[PDB]
Amino acid sequence: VDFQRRYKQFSQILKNIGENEGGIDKFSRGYESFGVHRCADGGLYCKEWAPGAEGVFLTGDFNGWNPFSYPYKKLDYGKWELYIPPKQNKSVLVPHGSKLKVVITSKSGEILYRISPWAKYVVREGDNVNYDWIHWDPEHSYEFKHSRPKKPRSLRIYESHVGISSHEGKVASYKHFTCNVLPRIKGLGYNCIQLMAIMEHAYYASFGYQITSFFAASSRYGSPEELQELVDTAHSMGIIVLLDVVHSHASKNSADGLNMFDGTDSCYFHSGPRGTHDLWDSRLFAYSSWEVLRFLLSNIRWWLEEYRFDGFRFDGVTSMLYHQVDEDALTYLMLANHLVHTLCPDSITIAEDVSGMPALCSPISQGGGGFDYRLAMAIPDKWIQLLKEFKDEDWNMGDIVYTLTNREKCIAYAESHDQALVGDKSLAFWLMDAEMYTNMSVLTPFTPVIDRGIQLHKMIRLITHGLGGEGYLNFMGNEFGHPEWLDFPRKGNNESYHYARRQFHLTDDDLLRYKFLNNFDRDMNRLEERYGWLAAPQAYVSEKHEGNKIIAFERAGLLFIFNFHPSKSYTDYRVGTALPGKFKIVLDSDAAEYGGHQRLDHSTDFFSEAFEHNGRPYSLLVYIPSRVALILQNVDL
């Protein structure tokens, strides 16, 4: 692991981009010439990279699917270009909405039909097996009417999927998300959206990880304009939008995928077994290839310019790095990060990497990967372990604090989207199990099982929110303890959509108890917006008492007190503080609005006296019931 070496390889390639292309700006604008483009003179210009093709042709509805009437002209470095002259009667060559295909002829004499790697729009019609390549040339392009919101001080991320964002068992639309989902997200106090499964993927049940058309916005949810309007509308509400970028692998589809484009097992990918991911059954990019760099870097630029995303989460980074480190893959990621931050410094990149490779989320100029954040993937593991293997009496407070404070900036979250899937368990299900379906009605007994579940759900989220990282993430539904599970239509359930949805209406039902968890989430994030503890320095933990099961710490001037003891409550409990004066409760999980027992009097003045305790110069006395979390603010006398 040589940091000087990683930077030298990066600096060298970036320098070549400047001398052989026109810099990284021009280099990443390949989408302007590659693919299919109607020119201002009425003609059509086309260009593809296909080094192993014998011939390249364009065909479709516009020429009666004549396969060879439009041959590309062969260029240097495996490229092909085509210009079709304007029609004599000055009508359009390729009408909006019509079908196209690139024809590839092999040295074997085989005739292959392909969708362009640079396609904007692909549609599956009715019950067909394969996707069609639809030429996108609308009457009116969408014009963005709102500017980027100011860079947020801290990220409070709402991880989302457009298709499952309604209560119906169908693929929900971009417009539905825009009209009905966006204002819910804003009201919860989230200032950032992590948009999954946007890059086009033929297999809906892959949850967006199986890419077929890399420049195509998934047609499932609607048209490209409807996606642009979604992002634009989000900006008007003061919310930035991040895209999940999958550049780690590609679907093996060849008819409507990137695989075997030029009839070869090594075009955008590596030749042989090295270019295949056995566990995922997918193809692997040749990041060392100059044209693969152009392709992927132009893709990043594409999502920034055309759809105005505010940044990216690069999925599957761990896979990219380890076939020994893949120095070609890391050099791309550095170039990708360099690209994003050079065009806009306020843009954000997040790395999904479980390996924890050093310096990945530190600056490139220090030999780093250049990522702004990494996911704190150790945190959900900890909550699963505790809930699976340990009775409440046996929870190690010191272990909880170590996991949450162990840190490069990370995005903290309590549970993952993987945990919302079928066969797995959510936090809500770990805590309430079968009583999830019997006692979530306010007309039923408030059993000790439901009570314990509701309280720990709030506490687990809050301590993760306040202690765990420099950013927070929440997967759609979990903010109110969404019941049941998530599943996509597939073979294993006979193409069922019954669990491919989200029951947002559960929070609106006054007769159900999901509103309690939802209310807590909204006030938690609104509190962070006021005090900004996520951007504050790392907390000072004054107490992790194993016997009393109390965790106490200070961050951003606020005082956090957690009582994880399953039965004991404390009436004159001493907690150390940094500041003298009067303290007031600013958040209490025992409030009636959160599904608590309303035991605390919020009008109570807490006074800090000069009395050393737990390494703090001052201390106060508090009443903290079993399974209750408290946040206190120092006010003025």
Numbering used by the authors: 43 to 365, 384 to 467, 471 to 700
Paper text:
GBE (also known as 1,4-glucan:1,4-glucan 6-glucanotransferase) transfers α-1,4-linked glucose units from the outer ‘non-reducing’ end of a growing glycogen chain into an α-1,6 position of the same or neighbouring chain, thereby creating glycogen branches. Almost all sequence-annotated branching enzymes, including those from diverse organisms, belong to the GH13 family of glycosyl hydrolases (also known as the α-amylase family) and fall either into subfamily 8 (eukaryotic GBEs) or subfamily 9 (prokaryotic GBEs). In several GH13 enzymes, this constellation of three acidic residues functions as the nucleophile (Asp357, hGBE1 numbering hereinafter), proton donor (Glu412) and transition state stabilizer (Asp481) in the active site.
Inspection of the asymmetric unit content as well as symmetry-related protomers did not reveal any stable oligomer arrangements, consistent with GBE1 being a monomer in size-exclusion chromatography (data not shown), similar to most GH13 enzymes. hGBE1 is an elongated molecule (longest dimension >85 Å) composed of four structural regions: the N-terminal helical segment (aa 43–75), a carbohydrate-binding module 48 (CBM48; aa 76–183), a central catalytic core (aa 184–600) and the C-terminal amylase-like barrel domain (aa 601–702). The hGBE1 active site is a prominent surface groove at the (βα)6-barrel that could bind a linear glucan chain via a number of subsites (left), each binding a single glucose unit. We posit that this surface region, unique to branching enzymes, facilitates access to the active site by an incoming glucan acceptor chain. Additionally, the tyrosyl hydroxyl group hydrogen bonds with the His289 backbone oxygen (left). Mutation of Tyr329 to the smaller amino acid serine (Ser329mutant) likely removes these interactions (right) and creates a solvent accessible cavity within this hydrophobic core, both of which could lead to destabilized protein.
